[PDB]
Amino acid sequence: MDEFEMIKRNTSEIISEEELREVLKKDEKSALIGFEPSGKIHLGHYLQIKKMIDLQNAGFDIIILLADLHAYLNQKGELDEIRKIGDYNKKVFEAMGLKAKYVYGSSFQLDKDYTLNVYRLALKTTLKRARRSMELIAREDENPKVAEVIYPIMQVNPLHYEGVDVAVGGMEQRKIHMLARELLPKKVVCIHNPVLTGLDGEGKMSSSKGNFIAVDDSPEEIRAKIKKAYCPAGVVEGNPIMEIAKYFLEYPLTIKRPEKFGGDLTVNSYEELESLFKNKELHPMDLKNAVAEELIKILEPIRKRLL
């Protein structure tokens, strides 16, 4: 894989790929991701951080926006407590091996120019579109607040992207990013990462849903979570165990089993794994055993540093 293919690997879309190729030619390029700070950092976060690390390996300067004001607007609590969750997230991201600059949103998002741009964009953005943009992001609320529609307009504020060539986020961000594509004065390449399925297979992985493996989970804990996880024989779609295998594991993968079940299996790619599992040659228990043990090893250094 050249740089472009490394970056493209395991993303859901790049907007646009011709734009990304132009960016890669530059000496200096920057990529941004924002996160509302989360009390637990989970594999969904890790997947994206891994992508920022790809970008870093591709010579991008990395910026992590600790989106405290956004989290505030999205009902995650008071700013001071959010910022301390932010500082913890920074430690986790550093433990994952990311080399980045960290910025707290509230550092600049209360500046007069930033605020003026919020209001200018507020004039340009329909309520309907703002609300549509937040469907996968907004905290559940029986009586949606004005804060909900301020959030996306802040996210499209041009002062977040000045000197940034690439923005990365989950596919949940795509409607907001489409807003930005249309409104931003200077185009920024969007790279969208896939959204992991929840361990119970019931919806998307999320902090509020308690359906994820946190990167600092004890090995006992990871094993129990994976043991209970949705993982029907033969089915790859919406199978979180297969997702973990696709997104986190290295190949060739050596799947240890009893000789009773075929004995050790060596698989040279995720697509190879996909065919075996789909053909019912690899049973969920062994796939889970392998995924849990490889995942524990993957996360070990991170859990260890957070010690």
Q: Which residues lie near ligand 4BF (CB under 6 A)?
A: 34-36, 65, 67, 70, 137, 155, 160, 169, 173
Task: Closer to ligand 4BF by CB, 65 or 299: give it.
Answer: 65
Cβ distance to ligand 4BF smaller for residue 34 or 284: 34
Please report how close the Cβ of residue 233 comes to ligand 4BF at its closest, in angstroms.
34
- DSSP code for 214: B
Nearer to ligand 4BF, 166 or 273 (CB): 166
Residue 104: both structure tokens together: 């707290």
Strand partners, 65: 34, 103
* Residue nearest ligand 4BF, Cβ-based: 34
Q: What is the nearest approach in angstroms of ligand 4BF to the Cβ of residue 169?
A: 6
Give 96 or 295: the residue with its C-beta nearer to ligand 4BF.
96
Long-range contacts, 224-232 (Cβ 8 Å, 24+): 225/199, 226/199, 226/288, 226/291, 226/292, 226/295, 227/288, 227/292, 228/199, 228/200, 229/199, 229/200, 229/201, 229/288, 230/197, 230/199, 230/200, 230/201, 230/202, 231/201, 231/284, 231/287, 231/288, 232/284
Comparison of 114 and 251: residue with beta carbon closer to ligand 4BF: 114
**Least gap, CB of 19 to ligand 4BF (angstroms):** 18
Q: How far is the CB of 181 from ligand 4BF (least distance, A)?
A: 13
Q: Cβ 166 to ligand 4BF, closest distance in Å?
A: 12
DSSP 42: B
User: 126: which 2 tokens?
Assistant: 């329909």
CB of 78 to ligand 4BF, least distance (A): 17
HSE (CB half, 13 Å, CA atoms) of 149? 17
Q: Which residues share a beta bridge with 61?
A: 30
**H or E stretch covering 149:** helix 147-155
Find the shortest distance in angstroms from Cβ 190 to ligand 4BF. 11
Of 66 and 265, CB closest to ligand 4BF = 66
Q: Which is nearer to ligand 4BF, 167 or 291 (CB)?
A: 167
β-strand pairing of 265-267 with 253-255: antiparallel
Residue pair 63/99 in contact (Cβ under 8 Å)? The answer is: no
